[PDB]
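User: Can you fold this complex?
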Amino acid sequence: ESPSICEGFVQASSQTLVIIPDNERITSNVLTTFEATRLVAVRAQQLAINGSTMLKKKYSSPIDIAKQELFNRKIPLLVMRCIKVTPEGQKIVEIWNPREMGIPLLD
Amino acid sequence: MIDQKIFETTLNIDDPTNFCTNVEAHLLKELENIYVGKCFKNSFILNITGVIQRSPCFIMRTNNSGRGYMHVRFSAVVSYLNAFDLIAAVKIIKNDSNIILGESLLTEPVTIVIPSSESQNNVAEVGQIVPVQLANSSVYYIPGRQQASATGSIFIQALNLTKLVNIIEMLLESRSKKDFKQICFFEKLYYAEVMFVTLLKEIINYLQFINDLCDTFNNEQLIKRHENIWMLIEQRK
Amino acid sequence: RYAVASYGPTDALTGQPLDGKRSHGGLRLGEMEHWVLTAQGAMQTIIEKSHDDSDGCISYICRNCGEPAIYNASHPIYKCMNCDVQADIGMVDSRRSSIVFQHEMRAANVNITSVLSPRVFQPA
Amino acid sequence: MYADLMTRTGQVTSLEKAGLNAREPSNVLLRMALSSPVQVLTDAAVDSAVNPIYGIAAPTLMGSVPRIGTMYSDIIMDEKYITENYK
Amino acid sequence: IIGKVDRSVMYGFDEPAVVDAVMRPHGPNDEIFGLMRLRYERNLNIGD
Amino acid sequence: GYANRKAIFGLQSCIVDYYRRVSIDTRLVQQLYGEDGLDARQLETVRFETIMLSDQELEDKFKYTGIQSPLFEEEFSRLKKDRDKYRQIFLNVENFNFSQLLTDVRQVPVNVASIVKNILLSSTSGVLPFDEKSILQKYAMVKTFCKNLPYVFINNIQERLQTPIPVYLKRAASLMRMLIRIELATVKTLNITCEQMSAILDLIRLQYTQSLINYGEAVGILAAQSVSEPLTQYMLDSHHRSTNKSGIVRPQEIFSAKPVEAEQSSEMLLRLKNPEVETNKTYAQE
Amino acid sequence: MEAGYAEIAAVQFNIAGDNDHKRQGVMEVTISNLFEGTLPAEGGIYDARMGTTDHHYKCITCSHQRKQCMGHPGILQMHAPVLQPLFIAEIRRWLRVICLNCGAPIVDLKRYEHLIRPKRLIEAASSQTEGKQCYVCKAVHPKIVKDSEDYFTFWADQQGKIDKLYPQIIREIFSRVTYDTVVKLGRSKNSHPEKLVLKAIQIPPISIRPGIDINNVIQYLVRKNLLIPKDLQIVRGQKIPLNIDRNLQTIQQLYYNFLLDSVAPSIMRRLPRKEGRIRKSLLGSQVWSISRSTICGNSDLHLDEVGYPISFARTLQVAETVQHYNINRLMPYFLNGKRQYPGCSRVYKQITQSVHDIEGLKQDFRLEVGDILYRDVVTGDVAFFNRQPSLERSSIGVHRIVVLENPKISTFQMNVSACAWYNADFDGDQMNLWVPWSVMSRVEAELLCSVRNWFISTKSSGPVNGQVQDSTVGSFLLTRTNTPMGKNVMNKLHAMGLFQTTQTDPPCFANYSPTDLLDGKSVVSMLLRQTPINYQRAPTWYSEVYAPYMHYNKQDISTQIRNGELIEGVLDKKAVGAGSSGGIYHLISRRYGPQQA
Ligand SMILES: [Mg+2]
Ligand SMILES: [Zn+2]
Ligand SMILES: [Zn+2]
Ligand SMILES: [Zn+2]
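Assistant: Here's the predicted assembly.
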């Protein structure tokens, strides 16, 4: 009996974001090439949809502007890294800063 | 009835750069744009109170749109209708609607329908105002609709209960503030914890009914305009 | 030799482009190409090729029961057939082949419910 | 990596469908993608199996895109930075 | 080519062709059909 | 194709997590990716000088005698200890293998000898005048760098806070520590000044950081691809081979976890006891 | 309202009961007629409420124009119940376990408390269990046998007397099962055997059966359902009239062949095998904006460059979103249209949310900020370059586009040394190439999938690229000590000409008079000075097999490079060859990065 829904606790309990203190993070302080590439791609798409920038040197493509923002440490994004899914509905992340963190080769 | 309620929802942000400049104001504006005047999760959400919890503005992972979502957990004041509640005014729209229904101009947008099986039915006309009592079949708070849907008919632990008795005390002040000759005329026309709760609910229903009856009929000429209902109830003594 | 633009005949069933140059649309990124792109950790070229340049669609899952929902923002319909009143429709990016697959399985009376990632709120 | 995958359960598990059942029993979608989707689908239905979405095949068969590579780490917007600088 | 009424067919290929054929043959079902032949002038291109 | 697809679906779920462990969903497959946490594209083969040297040869070459401080006795004892550990581990590895011989060439992220050579070539000064203070300072900073080497696997913050390092992280950087000790020995950095030595150390740290595996890298597919191709050439070599190892039969036995009965080319290699009685062929034959 | 973004975290497979269908289906199928006129019949199996297979009409249910509508399930209430075709074995295993007269289990359940849930029911069913007696109603247990002519028929024999187990009887028996028996037998609540019998099957959404083949079986099923009387109350031993027996058997076989025929192609036949739904539509896909052609060599292309024929560069397009910074650069693209190169044929105006062809925009002349323009692929753009089968990690890489504006060239041109990435040759091989048009994919392609990343093999940690064939032997001839005519020297003009096609910054020959004989190794050292390395190995030229014969020049049998100055020896496969670990290109990669390599 029952249509697989009435007893179905399908709605997962909402999670609370716990941010690990800045002195407790144990992940690399250097952007992995995946993370740097994702940051550049997100920033460049957002410049395509919006167009605003903090650069002084004006470029003719959002890719170049986002790449320089990552290189010149003005990209307005925060890489958050998540390490847990606790049964207590408590997602454990540590929010890193791409401006403070090192930058891989990418070239 | 009105009561604040917490709602959890996920927004979508088509320009996260502009969104985060004034994050809280943008969240309030978007929640007002999306959630006011519409039913949600067995509620109506009359007004948006400030948010309680909100998420960081993530970026949509699964699509290359570059947008973000952000989860929002906010409180909002809603309007709910219980069983056999008393709303004092309905306004009919169409005469080719022989099933007899109408629209409500009160601060609880509800499409009200009245069955055509009772004696006091099929006699009304378009543009007249008639009090209607909700039936026992509850209220359909379907979502995405600018007004709720309902059915109705023409009317014929100690400190926990302190909050309930607190509401009725302020409602009495609402009755005294407004003009009392209309209230007197209308009252002449209509003349442990669980039982306390239901008794208090009935008291609330009747007192809110008389107050809304006083409010609904701003000027006295409509009373003669809608005089065909006075006899309709008076014959039912 | 063959070269195709972003438009062409699409499969009636899956919504994917047709097969080869003869059907005026197609060319395939099979299993191996997806393995290679994942090994490179592409996941933005995989998104683009597999969704934007293929059978891309936006599913809706009620999030209150996990069953697919009925949503349309132009003609307003925010409803579910399992909890109607308590619907919490969520926009889920997906592919039309995946939805067709889920419908094939559901038609075999094995019900599919998607849990959906729970909402995360930073502390007050 | 090959050896650590097979020996991760304390027993030598093969790369065949039996080994995939032994290592990832709850990943119904992955085993469906590997071989014999109807049989493993029947088994998942009768077992009421819940398949958490991870890896490559499980989100691919669901139409999503796997959380590996470029999209392993989530990206959020720095409200403080935009507020202080962009306007 | 062979406009038929709309159920006409197009060319389709990206290489232009010169037409030398117009016939209306009587098929097995005695009905008339199109059967137009196109000619392509092929030099030894790079990649042949 | 058959073998590769089976292997791919076996391994595809193995993804490097934020700890550089290889994990399925959340269950571990590996404590560290290659047990060193290094990308396969960032490896260079360099010889370890001290491995084959006799004890007196080691003392002749690597023992520093220009200063009577016991710090250099400690440094040379550390070199000898590292050489002995390498010999022991790889002699054991040779022991439980058929014909895997010990070699002193190993793949490491940073070629310390090349970096030392480059800095020495670019050095303005030639033979540096003797200076005990600078030599002791250089030794101290090399030792501190080697002590802080496992912190390339965590970050600079836990390096500043000097928080404890997990044991496996210390073990992962043991080979790089050994190479750095061998190549930055005081007998080899006499002409390298303190500024040039600090430059060498930061360059080594940077190249180590750039050699680590990425978070989220789909390493399982990498392993499946890397092992699938050699099978193609392996069976194409069956027509040189005859103990039925022809075809994918042996790879089938390995990958399908076939039991002992299912084996067709089973072998044992048993060592004769009493290592002074196994040098003769007659006793071995009997 | 607004549907906020969400991601799927888990999938739960459950058996769908009759309530599942009844509450999930959008309507009920009552009439067997497919089409009235040229439109679907309301209440028919093609009813538009279940989806749309035509651009003419919308879904009614969701009001979407086909591509935006995923289909919605339909419900057909069977006049007589049917067994679930997928779970016939599960029904059989449940029947033999449980008593058919009271709903209580007759197998000793306490003996299975120590077993995992998946194993309990199958182990209990594996027992003998025949001829047993119930402990609460004393009814003896008939033995269950499967018919040898069909899969869904159960014969219950009580010591010899044979009676067919009908779906109604089976449904009642399962409705007699208590939840405690299901739980104690290693089955979840949602796997109650009551769900294994269907009174209302689900008519699948027409979106998965488009085009008017498996709809034939659906229509046949509805027609044969209409033939059954609406109140076929079959008790055990009823002995219903034989016509009803064949009609019910036909309905059951029709449903079974609708689900698992040959497992017409049924639903389940669509899934397995390579051409199935999974291995073809899910694990792979067909894509747009992709081109395929025959590869060919081009010695004048950089290793990270591909020769894209111009005819293709106008077919494939790159989406450039107009903003304030790129207005002036994008204007020449817009003006050219399809008439010139570089041009563009598309415009996506956001305010109108519409796409316009460039030959219909003679009066627009204006691109707003936020407009999307689809311009042609110009030289310098990144493009993915793939040869199938994609065995290696380097089988897909990104090359900078070099557009060959010769209209007579249609082959993909690559440097010969770039073949080691794809294991390709030019004997007729074809490689797919697609240009990323989105900003995200372009960024990723240039930063992550560029072929400079795959210069060092992931498989073997050595370099994949190098000199092959004519470059290896050419390097040997260039660096060998003695030509047959004498010493290997060249005048100033020819040493100058060696550097013509390198495309780097040419060295300085002002120190050399026109009559100065530049050595063979001096010119190599001139190039290697830009990336000085140290290398010392025996060349492949010096082999001990050849050594007893031939005179080996002493200056050729030891290649030795000191700080990028080639001192002695020759360059051959060991030094410059492809795949050579420790070669000069490997060292250049190690010290200066793979791009300089
Ligand atoms: Mg070939
Ligand atoms: Zn729902
Ligand atoms: Zn629809
Ligand atoms: Zn019984």
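The pocket of zinc ion (ligand 2) is lined by residues C 62, 64-65, 67, 80, 82-83, 87 (CB under 6 Å). The longest strand of chain A covers residues 77-82.
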